[PDB]
DNA sequence: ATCGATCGATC
DNA sequence: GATCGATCGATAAAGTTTTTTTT
């Protein structure tokens, strides 16, 4: 029943990408800013998005944006499927990511007990003692050489 | 006064604070009875004041 | 009444025996502390639990000894101290409901009747440290007096599990409730679902908090030869990171013991290790009212407030009116009159003093340390040039980098009290000019660069030669 | 030296 | 085809006085 709920938030976010959140007409603020987000992307080829917490809260009035705040440890490999469907219908090797930003509140590191498994929480602080740049895997072409090793898990 | 008082009364009966107690502690030295008195009052110390207020 | 293989505890008489004792109290204990109280603290406080919605009732729990009955309940608390708090968490939910059944307008009988409240029996009995903890003390209340040392962050705990095998959709959620996780050896959710790859999706089921703290007792009349030893702590409720390391402490702990594996890769085990589990701990923007503002405006009506603050700063000091001027003035440390572009001046100034040795030069500085809650205190080579900030130190927990701030940055909201400004080394006494001028500390260390500021305010207590 | 895993044999 | 038994392989260890530049 979360499948169709995951399918509900699939199209409701997609329908949000069909509209804008533009309040002023030709006084600045050109309409359909997410369509232009695809348009800048198909020139410089950076493979990103950039969505804010405001304009998705103020479409379903918190009936949907409050749901993803406690579930998108699971819902993150769901919304990627819908945008992968809308890109062929709106645009012409394709890996992406989901980049939320600008939640209202800001916490410190001393406040992480139980609600912070699968949530979204902006955290401040400073950074020390970095490391190098190595590759990760996420997808294999590996299989056994018994008969044919073309199994792609 | 915990049943060894028969030997604690001996200081109270005989008295002799200023010199017998001075010759009591460290009798193995040459002279200097004045300076062995300067230590024994520090062995009993002496509390300054139960101050109560914030005057440590 | 029921009978358990483990305990011998009763059925809910003692709950009702508490509930009449709780409600029909109004006063007791007047005889054990005979001095010569119209209503009980808890009677108002049990109404006070709902109207704030909290979950904690700090029970003094020396009331059953004052009451005529409930001694059997009292002397079962100190002998089976896990089921008795497990009983009373059910009753306090119902005893709260015993107030909602009177007034049905109290939070709609649903939502505050879901979050489980709890209790805290504290300051009960007496104990005397560590060299009395016999092996017979297996499940009892203990009252430690000591000092905590160092803390680790919270690790999670298996309170609920999850499973999913390789079928289309099968999202069962088994429980644990033990030290044992139980699994199926054959699939479900369909008829033709044979024994297959049941997988463990770990990052889906929720966890609570948990934290271990190390304690070492204070040398409280120790017989001057014995080394003060140590014991650990453990916590479960919402008391994580509310007890910072390095304070005088008292805990109301139960007792437990765990096994350990000798070899790291076998199931072999035998000299155990004990640890306590705390139920309640105790150490030993202000809420601005309006009566204080009305009280100081009477003092502000008095023109001699300068002279009134001249006489208040000296409870024992000789008069010496001139030094008392700037000290309260530096304590009244201006504000940050900062422009948008240009300037960035701050009204903080810097007084000093030097002269006759030991004229309460330190005790005045101690007296200034009284009047400010968040400040510093200098030492005799407690800090140094490299010992102030800019650390590399190989700490005993992780052997990695840590950048702890110096005292001049640490006075963000205080007054830097500092001394020995004729015996300070000339490797240092070179960076305070920067915090005199750019209000910052520039760090040139192998870790990283940072121009962090320091909202500071200084005074200097020199010495003659 | 002990425990765990894999392979082979028997039911 | 599944279960039980036997055989083979893999798993457990520990540090803190001389010597360099440097302040």
Curated annotation (Swiss-Prot), chain B:
Binding residue positions for ATP 1: 30
Annotated source species: Saccharomyces cerevisiae (strain ATCC 204508 / S288c)
Protein name (Swiss-Prot/TrEMBL): DNA replication licensing factor MCM7
The organism's place on the tree of life at top rank: Eukaryota
Family: Belongs to the MCM family.
Note: Present with 166 molecules/cell in log phase SD medium.
Residues passing through the membrane, by range: none
Function description: Acts as a component of the MCM2-7 complex (MCM complex) which is the putative replicative helicase essential for 'once per cell cycle' DNA replication initiation and elongation in eukaryotic cells. Core component of CDC45-MCM-GINS (CMG) helicase, the molecular machine that unwinds template DNA during replication, and around which the replisome is built.
Gene behind this protein: MCM7
Assembly description: Component of the MCM2-7 complex. The complex forms a toroidal hexameric ring with the proposed subunit order MCM2-MCM6-MCM4-MCM7-MCM3-MCM5; loaded onto DNA, forms a head-head double hexamer. Interacts with CSM1 and MCM10.
Localization per Swiss-Prot or TrEMBL: Cytoplasm; Nucleus
From Swiss-Prot, chain C:
Domain MCM per the UniProt entry, residue ranges: 305-465
Transmembrane segments: none
The organism's place on the tree of life at top rank: Eukaryota
Sample GO molecular function, one term: DNA replication origin binding
GO cellular component: CMG complex; cytoplasm; DNA replication preinitiation complex; MCM complex; MCM core complex; nuclear pre-replicative complex; nuclear replication fork; nucleoplasm
Alphabetically ordered keywords of this record: ATP-binding, Cell cycle, DNA replication, DNA-binding, Helicase, Hydrolase, Nucleotide-binding, Nucleus, Phosphoprotein
Any Gene Ontology biological process: nuclear DNA replication
Complex and partners: Component of the MCM2-7 complex. The complex forms a toroidal hexameric ring with the proposed subunit order MCM2-MCM6-MCM4-MCM7-MCM3-MCM5; loaded onto DNA, forms a head-head double hexamer.
Protein name per the record: DNA replication licensing factor MCM4
The organism of origin for this protein: Saccharomyces cerevisiae (strain ATCC 204508 / S288c)
Lineage, top ranks: Eukaryota, Fungi, Dikarya, Ascomycota, Saccharomycotina
Gene: MCM4
């Amino acid at each position: 029943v979360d499948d169709v709920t995951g399918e509900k938030v699939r199209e409701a976010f997609e329908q949000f990408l069909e509209d804008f959140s533009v309040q002023s007409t030709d006084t600045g603020e050109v309409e359909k800013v997410y369509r232009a987000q695809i348009e800048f992307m198909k020139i410089y080829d950076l493979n990103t998005i950039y969505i804010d917490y405001q304009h998705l809260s103020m479409r379903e009035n918190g009936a949907l944006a409050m749901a993803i705040s406690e579930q998108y440890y699971r819902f993150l490999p769901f919304l990627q499927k819908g945008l992968r469907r809308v890109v062929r219908k709106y645009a012409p090797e394709r890996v992406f990511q989901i980049s939320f930003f600008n939640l209202p509140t800001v916490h410190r590191i001393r406040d992480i007990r139980s609600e912070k498994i699968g949530s979204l929480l902006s955290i401040s602080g400073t950074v020390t003692r970095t490391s190098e740049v190595r590759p990760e895997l996420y997808k294999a072409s590996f299989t056994c050489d018994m008969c044919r090793a073309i199994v792609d898990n | 006064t915990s049943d060894v008082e028969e030997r604690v009364m001996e200081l109270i009966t005989s008295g002799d604070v200023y010199n017998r107690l001075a010759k009591s502690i460290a009798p193995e030295i040459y002279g200097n009875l004045d300076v062995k008195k300067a230590l024994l009052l520090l062995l009993v110390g002496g509390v300054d004041k139960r101050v109560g207020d914030g005057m440590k | 009444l029921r009978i358990i293989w483990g305990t011998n505890v009763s059925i809910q008489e003692c709950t009702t025996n508490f509930r009449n004792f709780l409600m029909s109290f109004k006063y007791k204990f007047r005889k054990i502390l005979d001095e010569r109280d119209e209503e009980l603290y808890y009677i108002k406080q049990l109404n006070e639990m709902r109207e704030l919605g909290t979950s904690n009732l700090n029970l003094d729990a020396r009331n059953l000894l004052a009451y005529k009955q409930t001694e059997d309940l009292y002397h079962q608390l100190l002998n089976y101290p896990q089921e008795v708090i497990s009983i009373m968490d059910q009753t306090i939910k119902d005893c709260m409901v015993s107030l909602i059944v009177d007034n049905n307008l109290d939070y709609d009988l649903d939502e505050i009747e879901t979050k489980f409240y709890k209790v805290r029996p504290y300051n009960v009995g007496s104990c005397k440290g560590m060299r009395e903890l016999n092996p017979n003390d297996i499940d009892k209340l203990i009252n430690l007096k000591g000092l905590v040392l160092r803390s680790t962050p919270v690790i999670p705990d298996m309170k609920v599990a999850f499973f999913k095998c390789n079928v289309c959709d099968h999202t069962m959620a088994v429980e644990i409730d033990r030290g044992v996780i139980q699994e199926p050896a054959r699939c479900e959710r369909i008829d033709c679902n044979e024994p297959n790859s049941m997988s463990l999706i770990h990052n889906r089921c929720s966890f609570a908090d948990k934290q271990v703290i190390k304690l070492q007792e204070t040398p409280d009349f120790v017989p001057d030869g014995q080394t003060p030893h140590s014991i650990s702590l453990c916590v479960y409720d919402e008391l994580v990171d509310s007890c910072r390391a390095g304070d005088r402490i008292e805990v109301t702990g139960t007792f437990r013991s765990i096994p350990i594996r000798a070899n790291s890769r076998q199931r072999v085990l035998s000299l155990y290790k004990t640890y306590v589990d705390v139920v309640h701990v105790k150490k030993v923007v202000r809420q601005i009212t309006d009566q204080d503002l009305a009280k100081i405006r009477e003092v502000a009506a008095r023109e001699d407030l300068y002279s009134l603050l001249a006489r208040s700063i000296a409870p024992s000091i000789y008069e010496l009116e001139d030094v008392k001027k700037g000290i309260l003035l530096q304590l009244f440390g201006g504000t940050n009159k900062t422009f948008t572009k240009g300037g960035r001046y701050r009204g903080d100034i810097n007084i000093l003093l030097c002269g006759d040795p030991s004229t309460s030069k330190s005790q005045i500085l101690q007296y200034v340390h009284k009047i400010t809650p968040r400040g510093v205190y200098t030492s005799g080579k407690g800090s140094s040039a490299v010992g102030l900030t800019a650390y590399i130190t190989r700490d005993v927990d992780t052997k990695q980098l840590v950048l702890e701030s110096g005292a001049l940055v640490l006075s963000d909201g205080g007054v830097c009290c500092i001394d020995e400004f004729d015996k300070m080394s000339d490797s240092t006494r070179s960076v305070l000019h920067e915090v005199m001028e750019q209000q910052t500390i520039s760090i040139a260390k192998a870790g990283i660069i940072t121009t962090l500021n320091a909202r500071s305010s200084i005074l200097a207590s020199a010495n003659p030669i």
